């Protein structure tokens, strides 16, 4: 029984590997060689959103691409105004051990979570004029690592208990749970259509889940260390992971395999944040070497370095219109980067 | 700036003032981190996050026992990178689980993030270890071959009126932990080993003294004097 099942699993893995090898007629690197290189991406710190008093682990841009929310050990969840460097709100969290934050697509709600194993949803648009926690989503046995909003009523959270959950804010209970990971899930990225999403865990794997079905569709085992960050290609048919072995990777949901690896011999520190550009040609990627590197997503050529931080880059996000890149570091700073023409 | 952009700037200035006040209030407490095993007895030291607040010599201490999350202390130890110190409670009486404790201490010491966080090591369950040594049924030589050729170093400090065998065992355990600690760090962070009898009321005083030494070292580093 157990022996046969352990074997059947091995033969199924071998069949999956053989299918992936058969479908790999070519590679993305050799296909995208005739395209002109993007050049050297020069980016300057337009704004420095200072005011945090501790190390930042999370940020999220609003749908309007002007408001962003940041989380830090200081105990506050500031809603910045990136255009004018203004603190619209400063939400004091019950637990300062916050490693994640989110901004609702409608902009009415924000979320935070961390070592308290609780996702706190805050109502920004209240008639009382203050920000109060509308719902505390408890039910996870591990620290929350990432939380993303589907709409004003649904939010998907990933925790260090090897499970991801889909919540109902109105009710407060897990609508659907996502099991299958064998390590602490450290990031999640919702698809453009929010019908599917991926999660990167510490077992060096990324799993593509379905929010409605609730079952894992595909798995991607190409990394050698913990996946600290995961993003999604703008078209929704690919995603990029960032692991602790200083290499990013670009997996595809259709070919079911890694297309290209974004690594350099000079960089030995792990990736903490990954986000694509609006067109998807550029791959921003934070690194522990106090620097952020811009990777040409089609050629794996470092097109620039966003070296302006005095500590580890922890969070990083590109605006919805692609007009700016905001990087947060452990030096309690938050810098908005924009190209110069 | 407009009239409604000037008022927003004033609101942001008020928000920044409140943030500065909160930071000033929260900077006056020293944060710690309780680490150990199930049998260590970390809860009964000072006598998911289980915060513990105690004050000694008008200095506020905040000990964060991170229970709940239940595996290697990894991927959440990065948050405790600004803590003053790490209290690593270890049961020195159970030799069977001792090697696991040394491995855990080695993993914590060699962490990439806790490369500047000094560890206040407490050799808990001193009375149980003394009783085990006195009984003689359990010998440390069975689990640790190096104990056979180990002898109490000269110029030691056997302040308690205890048998040499108990002192030799305690010094052997402390030496193992110190040798683990001194293999890396290059003096950036150091380990402070102490012995706890599970009834001692001076654990808070020891933590305060070690934190004072750690803060003195940080002040030295801030002066480019070290």
């Amino acid at each position: 029984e157990l022996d046969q099942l352990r074997q059947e699993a091995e033969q199924l893995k071998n069949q999956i590997r053989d299918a992936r090898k058969a479908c790999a007629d070519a590679t993305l690197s050799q296909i995208t060689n005739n395209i002109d290189p993007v050049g050297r991406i020069q980016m300057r710190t337009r704004r420095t959103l200072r005011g945090h008093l501790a190390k930042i682990y999370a940020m999220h841009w609003g749908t309007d691409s002007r408001l962003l929310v940041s989380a830090s050990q200081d105990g506050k969840l500031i809603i910045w105004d990136s255009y004018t460097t203004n603190k619209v709100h400063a939400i004091p969290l019950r637990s300062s051990w916050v490693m994640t934050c989110a901004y609702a697509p409608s902009g009415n709600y924000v979320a935070c979570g961390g070592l308290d194993n609780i996702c706190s949803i805050y109502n920004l648009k209240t008639r009382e004029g203050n920000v109060r926690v509308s719902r505390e989503l408890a039910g996870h046995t591990g620290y929350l690592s990432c939380c993303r909003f589907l709409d004003d009523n649904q939010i998907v959270t990933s925790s260090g208990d090897t499970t991801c959950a889909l919540w109902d804010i109105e009710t407060g209970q897990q609508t659907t749970t996502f099991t299958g990971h064998t390590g602490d899930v450290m990031s999640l990225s919702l698809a453009p259509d929010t019908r599917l999403f991926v999660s990167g865990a510490c077992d060096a794997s990324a799993k593509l889940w379905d929010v409605r079905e609730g079952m894992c569709r595909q798995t991607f085992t190409g990394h050698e260390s913990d996946i600290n960050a995961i993003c999604f290609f703008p078209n929704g048919n690919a995603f990029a992971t960032g692991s602790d072995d200083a290499t990013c990777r670009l997996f595809d949901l259709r070919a079911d395999q890694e297309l290209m690896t974004y690594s350099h011999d000079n960089i030995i520190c792990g990736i903490t944040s990954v986000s694509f550009s609006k067109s998807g040609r550029l791959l921003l990627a934070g690194y522990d070497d106090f620097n952020c590197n811009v990777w040409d997503a089609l050629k794996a050529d470092r097109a620039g370095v966003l070296a302006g931080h005095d500590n580890r880059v922890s969070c990083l996000g590109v605006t919805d219109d692609g007009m700016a890149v905001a990087t947060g570091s452990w030096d309690s700073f938050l810098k908005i980067w924009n190209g110069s023409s | 700036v407009s009239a409604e952009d000037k008022a927003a700037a004033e609101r942001s200035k008020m928000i920044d003032k409140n943030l500065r006040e909160d930071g000033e209030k929260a900077r006056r407490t020293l944060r710690l981190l309780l680490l150990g095993a199930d049998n260590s007895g970390k809860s009964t030291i000072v006598k998911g996050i289980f915060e513990t607040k105690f004050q000694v010599d008008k200095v506020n201490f905040h000990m964060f026992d991170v229970g709940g999350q239940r595996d290697e202390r990894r991927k959440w130890i990065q948050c405790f990178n600004d803590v003053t110190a790490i209290i690593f409670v270890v049961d020195s009486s159970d030799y069977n689980r001792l090697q696991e404790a040394l491995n855990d201490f080695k993993s914590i010491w060699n962490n990439r993030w806790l490369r500047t966080i000094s560890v206040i090591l407490f050799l808990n369950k001193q009375d149980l270890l003394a009783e085990k040594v006195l009984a003689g049924k359990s010998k440390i030589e069975d689990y640790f071959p190096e104990f056979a050729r180990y002898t109490t170093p000269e110029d030691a400090t056997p302040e308690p009126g205890e048998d040499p065998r108990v002192t030799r065992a305690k010094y052997f355990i402390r030496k193992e932990f110190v040798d683990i600690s001194t293999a890396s760090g290059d003096g950036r962070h150091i380990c402070y080993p102490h012995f706890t009898c599970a009834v001692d009321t001076e654990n808070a005083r020891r933590i305060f003294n070690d934190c004072k030494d750690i803060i003195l070292q940080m002040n030295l580093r801030e002066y480019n004097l070290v």
Partner: single-chain antibody
Framework: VQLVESGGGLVQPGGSRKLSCSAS????????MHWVRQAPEKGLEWVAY????????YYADTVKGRFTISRDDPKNTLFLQMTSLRSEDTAMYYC??????????????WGQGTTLTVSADIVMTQATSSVPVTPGESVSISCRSS???????????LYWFLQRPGQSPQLLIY???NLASGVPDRFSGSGSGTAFTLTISRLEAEDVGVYYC?????????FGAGTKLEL
């Protein structure tokens, strides 16, 4: 959220009086507070403004020196020390709230009002003052500022308020395009920097009232004479 004001009666000319605005149901310490007077059979006129934390205080040119605004945050009350009461101060005083942050709805809740009976400005122009409109049809009000209210920030700072007969004014639109919460979808704002239009898709018995347009762009805060809607 409820603002109740008291302290207004019959005052001899040249005397002094103090108005108190009791605030409850909201974070009074985070809301900038205005005082708005309305003479009988006349339009709204801005009086004073005190911000959160009492950092900046702005008074109208017809009350500067005579009137002073102060806020007791701990006890949630706003006050106006009205001195040298001239016979032009015989008007109902309202206590409007205003929080200012990207996307805020300034002038959201207007207080109930207190009738006090004393025994370089952007001139908004609501040409029409009487409109015979029957329920079911669409009606469009129309203001016109002297200076363009479109700041470089891209926000046209014109607000549209409707007062039902015998009721405190309620904001319908903020920054011209925006619609206030609790406000029906049919009211709409269409704007040009010097021309502003408010349109209601369907007339309602509740809708009939006097509609006032204000500019928040320069400090003196003016309100258009208003356009009474006749059923």
């Amino acid at each position: 959220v409820q603002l109740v004001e008291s302290g207004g009666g019959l005052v001899q000319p040249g005397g002094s009086r103090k108005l108190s605005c009791s605030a409850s149901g909201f974070a009074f310490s985070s809301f900038g507070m205005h005082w708005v007077r309305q003479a009988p059979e006349k339009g709204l006129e801005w009086v004073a403004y005190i911000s959160s934390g009492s950092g900046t205080i702005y008074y109208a040119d017809t009350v500067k020196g005579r009137f002073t605004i102060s806020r007791d945050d701990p006890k949630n009350t706003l006050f106006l020390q009205m001195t040298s009461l001239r016979s032009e101060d015989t008007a109902m005083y309202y206590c409007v709230r205003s929080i200012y942050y990207y996307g805020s709805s300034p002038f959201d809740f207007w207080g109930q009002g207190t009738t006090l009976t004393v025994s370089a400005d952007i001139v908004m122009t609501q040409a029409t003052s009487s409109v015979p409109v029957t329920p079911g049809e669409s009606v469009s009000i129309s203001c016109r500022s002297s200076k363009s209210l479109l700041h470089s920030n891209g926000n046209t700072y014109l607000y549209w308020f409707l007062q039902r007969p015998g009721q405190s004014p309620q904001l319908l639109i903020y920054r011209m395009s925006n619609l206030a919460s609790g406000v029906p979808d049919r009211f709409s704002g269409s704007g040009s920097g010097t021309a502003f239009t408010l349109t209601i898709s369907r007339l309602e018995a509740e809708d009939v009232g006097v509609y006032y347009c204000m500019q928040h762009l320069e400090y003196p805060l003016t309100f258009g004479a208003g356009t009474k809607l006749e059923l």
